[PDB]
Write a protein that binds this DNA or RNA. Structure first.
Ligand SMILES: C[C@@H]1C[C@@H]([C@H](O)CC2CC(=O)NC(=O)C2)C(=O)[C@@H](C)C1
Ligand SMILES: [Mg+2]
Ligand SMILES: [Mg+2]
Ligand SMILES: [Mg+2]
Ligand SMILES: [Mg+2]
Ligand SMILES: [Mg+2]
Ligand SMILES: [Mg+2]
Ligand SMILES: [Mg+2]
Ligand SMILES: [Mg+2]
Ligand SMILES: [Mg+2]
Ligand SMILES: [Mg+2]
Ligand SMILES: [Mg+2]
Ligand SMILES: [Mg+2]
Ligand SMILES: [Mg+2]
Ligand SMILES: [Mg+2]
Ligand SMILES: [Mg+2]
Ligand SMILES: [Mg+2]
Ligand SMILES: [Mg+2]
Ligand SMILES: [Mg+2]
Ligand SMILES: [Mg+2]
Ligand SMILES: [Mg+2]
Ligand SMILES: [Mg+2]
Ligand SMILES: [Mg+2]
Ligand SMILES: [Mg+2]
Ligand SMILES: [Mg+2]
Ligand SMILES: [Mg+2]
Ligand SMILES: [Mg+2]
Ligand SMILES: [Mg+2]
Ligand SMILES: [Mg+2]
Ligand SMILES: [Mg+2]
Ligand SMILES: [Mg+2]
Ligand SMILES: [Mg+2]
Ligand SMILES: [Mg+2]
Ligand SMILES: [Mg+2]
Ligand SMILES: [Mg+2]
Ligand SMILES: [Mg+2]
Ligand SMILES: [Mg+2]
Ligand SMILES: [Mg+2]
Ligand SMILES: [Mg+2]
Ligand SMILES: [Mg+2]
Ligand SMILES: [Mg+2]
Ligand SMILES: [Mg+2]
Ligand SMILES: [Mg+2]
Ligand SMILES: [Mg+2]
Ligand SMILES: [Mg+2]
Ligand SMILES: [Mg+2]
Lengths: 100, 51, 205
RNA sequence: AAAGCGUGGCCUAUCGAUCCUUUAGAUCUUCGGAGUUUGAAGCUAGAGGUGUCAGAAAAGUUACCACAGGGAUUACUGGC
RNA sequence: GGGCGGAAGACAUUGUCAGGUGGGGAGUUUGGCUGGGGCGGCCAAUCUGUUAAAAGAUAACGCAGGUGUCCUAAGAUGAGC
RNA sequence: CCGACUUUGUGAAAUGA
RNA sequence: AAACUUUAAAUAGGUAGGAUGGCGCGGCUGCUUCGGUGAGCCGUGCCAUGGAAUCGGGUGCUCCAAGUGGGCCAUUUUUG
RNA sequence: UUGAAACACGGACCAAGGAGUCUGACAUGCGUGCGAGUCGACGGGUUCUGAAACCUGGGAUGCGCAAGGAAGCUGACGAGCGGGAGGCCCUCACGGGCCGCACCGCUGGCCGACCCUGAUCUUCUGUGAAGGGUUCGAGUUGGAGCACGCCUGUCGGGACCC
RNA sequence: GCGCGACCCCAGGUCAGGCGGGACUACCGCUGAGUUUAAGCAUAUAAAUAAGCGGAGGAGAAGAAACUUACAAGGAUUCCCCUAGUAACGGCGAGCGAACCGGGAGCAGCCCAGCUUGAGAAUCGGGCGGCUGUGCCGUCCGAAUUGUAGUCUGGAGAGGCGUCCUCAGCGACGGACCGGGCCCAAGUCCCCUGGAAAGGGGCGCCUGGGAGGGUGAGAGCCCCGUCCGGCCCGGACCCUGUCGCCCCACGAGGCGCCGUCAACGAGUCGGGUUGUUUGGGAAUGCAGCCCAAAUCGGGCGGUAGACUCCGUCCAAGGCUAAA
């Protein structure tokens, strides 16, 4: 981002050197979901089904108790960061199932 | 049996001297040769050497 | 222990006599390395003995940030902007480092300058005898090439000590630099409370 | 009223180190990418106690006994 | 009739945590002073008097005793007696 | 010795939600 | 009358015996006093026959470190 | 051992072997090199008897040159007295005066912890003219250290021998 | 009353092959004490050692960041120096103790699985035969569609386009390193003592050879050698040096333009708990058990936690000299 302040102390301290903007690299798209792999994962999601904790999270959301859904998702998955996004994905899967 | 306190390879075989002290010593080694009296007293036969 | 001394701290309770490392092979190490260097030079005649080129980079770490030193390789961006392809720089004696990042035009242009100088003073023999293709060099040029030895590009480690003499302007004298230095320490200490007070202005105000 | 007296008991005894926990204080410092924000460690002063009381966390037996020692030390002799 | 014949049956049981028991076993400890040591006692902290020989210091399992508390007054002070 | 998780599936009722 | 004393020895204890002393002058104080009043200090000038006997170079200052930390006898005081 | 000729232990005799060493860290004393620097110790070049020697790098490697704080952080605004070696002046000299190192004692200032303090100025929480302190520092107002060697001591190592 | 194809699995003294054991310096993996120190001792220390059980090579292991840093940032592995007896850890007691930065030694990157021949298994093996013999070719059988080969590995890449730029081998003679042999200067001159002259005395000589050994005593010169090198023989060679004939393309790569694609490793990470280990401290690694993933996603930034932003890298597959 914009260069340093030039003074050895303070907010954004250091020596002024003119900054340069780095052209994108591979692994800047690392994990960007793609059409075919979304296809593959969709299909096997439907063919295989849901795990029991996934089903219990569906039930907690179709009741609406999102705090408890997060809490059980955390106790299974292990970390808040994954629990919140598994809850987010099950909210996705439940809205896309009430859509029709 | 053993010997008392058997010698070990990690004695201090090499000693260090300050590089400037080596230079001092070699300068004072040179400066003493330029003397016929000390070259003689050190044992060399210098009685026909010209200068 | 006994009379006033520094408190002992010898780490000599394990079986250290099983792991004493004595260096009596040190001169032979030196001689072996020298023979190794000599025979590497003979095999790589007439390539420079220093090996491939290296970048000027800055050191890390506040203690050493101001001292330039040699790097591992020029980034892809330098090798591209110098007209020296990725796959071919190690071929003509220029290292390549895919991992570095350039954040400053100053570093990038300095390393371009090293690349350009090297490509000016590089001579390359043809892959075959009579077939001189692009990138090679003339026979009369090739006939005078020797094995350059030591550091054929020295990197000055830090900027030269110049202490010139200038005017002492009053706009320079009036500057309270200690007060300056304390004020942004205040800015850093208070950046928390100031932005909290600010954000609540949006929340409520 | 004042001079003054008063930093515990008329004076001589009535008591407690390190580590740890806990408490009090600044509108204090750190959590080392910058912040908000609980937690944690800090700094100064206390308490919880070591009574073997300058402060190990700790029951017996041995005639089945072992070792390094001791006449610094008993049971016999002698001596006062 | 695609079941070798029974009995138990998703309990026993295997795996891992969790609590109780565990001299069966392991490790170790089992203070000091002391007219030998053990038992006794505390002379290990510590006060007053004496010994302590008219400054101070002064020991013994010497003597006679004390202490591990009590107190918003039995602290401060002023007045009166 | 004991509890929980695990191998551990299938379905039925009675009390609790 | 060791755990009583009015009285009260002898030996032993402490301090002083000048040059690290005093007096004048003119200054400081944020202390002190009713107050140049004191207290002390500060600068300066004067004095001070060495301030009882004897004796004599000093641990005067410091560093590093050893061994020792079982005692025993005697005249006198003295506890069991 | 307080006490050995001891009725205390060891000792028949001879020959040879036989017991405070070597290493890492530190410390005082001394010698030597240089001295606000000093170390060339890991490497490189050279080396025609050489595992030696000699050269090189350091512009920040270690120690030192700056300390106080637990940490954020701040970081020495320029010293006087008493006594004193020795030098110099006056006197015929006795005696006096001046300059007075080191060292001892004394009283202060400056930096930092902790407390205290607030004219001004600024980006409003920062600066800090003035004034401080029965407190604290392994500080400062003295640059004295770096390297090697040696003896003694300490400690860890088998660590004086059994 | 059958002939079959596959799958699983048999027995084969079937054709051809690979494995076990040994040595211990160093290297890899598991296992794993205590005397001692702590002036006792019980965690700690001894020690992540000794012993035990296994695996290799001439080195082994490691190795191309799911890294450190907070910088103006660096850029695989390994070792030396300093970092540093420091941060840390510890009945915060005795004690224990690394790392980043920097300086040096040496330096090298690579290859797979996936979506991608489908007009066509283009791949591999074995038998047999031929030759130019570490292989190559012709033919048969078989493996393989539960995927061999080819392109690709995140630095990218797949495509389309482009003036353009880059591609093949075989001889010959050597040089270099390795081993071995043959040869290579000069008194044995005169006198004495002596068993012996290698000793004394005289006269001479070599020396790019006075290292050393032998020989009847202190031998440069009697012998072998040593200095200088010379001559011949034999290996491996695949390192490079110069000459000759053969001339490299419509395929691959590079460079540039594009914007559409752009697939990246699962009981794996991560979490809890338990034991061990560590300097690693609300837990450094490792392991068991249970929990159990993700694709605007995952791991780190040395204090547990929620959120906003930032820096950083892309694991769970493999190989790799030198120091
Ligand atoms: C109950 C507590 C016990 C004691 C302390 O915790 C014992 C510690 C202290 C020590 O020396 N190191 C240890 O590991 C034991 C203490 O402080 C008292 C006030 C009260
Ligand atoms: Mg022997
Ligand atoms: Mg040991
Ligand atoms: Mg008062
Ligand atoms: Mg009272
Ligand atoms: Mg605490
Ligand atoms: Mg952090
Ligand atoms: Mg306390
Ligand atoms: Mg008995
Ligand atoms: Mg019996
Ligand atoms: Mg006796
Ligand atoms: Mg037992
Ligand atoms: Mg025992
Ligand atoms: Mg006893
Ligand atoms: Mg008794
Ligand atoms: Mg005591
Ligand atoms: Mg008295
Ligand atoms: Mg009264
Ligand atoms: Mg009377
Ligand atoms: Mg008396
Ligand atoms: Mg008197
Ligand atoms: Mg005796
Ligand atoms: Mg006798
Ligand atoms: Mg006897
Ligand atoms: Mg004896
Ligand atoms: Mg005997
Ligand atoms: Mg002898
Ligand atoms: Mg330096
Ligand atoms: Mg003075
Ligand atoms: Mg002084
Ligand atoms: Mg010793
Ligand atoms: Mg012990
Ligand atoms: Mg002991
Ligand atoms: Mg023991
Ligand atoms: Mg350890
Ligand atoms: Mg072993
Ligand atoms: Mg390997
Ligand atoms: Mg150090
Ligand atoms: Mg002769
Ligand atoms: Mg000879
Ligand atoms: Mg000859
Ligand atoms: Mg010869
Ligand atoms: Mg283990
Ligand atoms: Mg763990
Ligand atoms: Mg644990
Ligand atoms: Mg490998």
């Amino acid at each position: 981002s914009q260069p340093k302040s030039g003074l050895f102390v303070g907010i954004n301290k250091g020596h002024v050197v003119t900054k340069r903007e780095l052209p994108p690299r591979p692994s800047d798209r690392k994990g960007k979901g793609t059409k075919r792999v979304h296809f593959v994962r969709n299909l096997i999601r439907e063919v295989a089904g849901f795990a029991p904790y996934e089903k219990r999270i569906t039930e907690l959301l179709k009741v609406g108790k999102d705090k408890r859904a997060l809490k059980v998702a955390k106790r299974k998955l292990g970390t808040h960061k994954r629990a919140k996004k598994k809850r987010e994905e099950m909210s996705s899967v439940l809205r896309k199932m009430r859509s029709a | 049996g053993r010997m008392f306190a058997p010698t070990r390879i990690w004695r201090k075989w090499h000693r260090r001297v300050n590089v400037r002290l080596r230079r001092v010593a070699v300068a004072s080694a040179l400066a003493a040769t330029a003397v016929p009296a000390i070259v003689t007293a050190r044992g060399h036969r210098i009685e026909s050497v010209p200068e | 222990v006994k009379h006033n001394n520094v408190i002992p701290n010898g780490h000599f309770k394990k079986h250290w006599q099983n792991y004493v490392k004595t260096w009596f092979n040190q001169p032979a190490r030196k001689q072996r390395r020298r023979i190794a260097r000599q025979k590497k030079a003979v095999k790589i005649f007439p390539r420079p003995t220093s090996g491939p080129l290296r970048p000027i980079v800055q050191c890390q770490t506040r203690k050493y940030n101001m001292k330039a030193r040699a790097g591992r390789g020029f980034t892809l961006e330098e090798l591209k902007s110098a007209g020296i392809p990725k796959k071919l720089a190690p071929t003509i004696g220029i290292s390549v480092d895919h991992r570095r990042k350039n954040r400053s035009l100053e570093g990038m242009q300095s390393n371009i300058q090293r690349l350009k100088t090297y490509k000016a003073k590089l001579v390359i023999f043809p892959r075959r005898a009579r077939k001189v293709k692009a990138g090679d060099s003339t026979p009369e040029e090739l006939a005078n090439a020797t094995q350059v030895q030591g550091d054929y590009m020295p990197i000055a480690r830090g900027e030269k000590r110049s202490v010139e003499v200038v005017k002492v302007t009053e706009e320079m004298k009036e500057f309270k630099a200690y007060g300056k230095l304390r004020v942004e320490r205040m800015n850093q200490r208070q950046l928390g409370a100031r932005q909290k007070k600010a954000a609540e202005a949006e929340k409520e105000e």
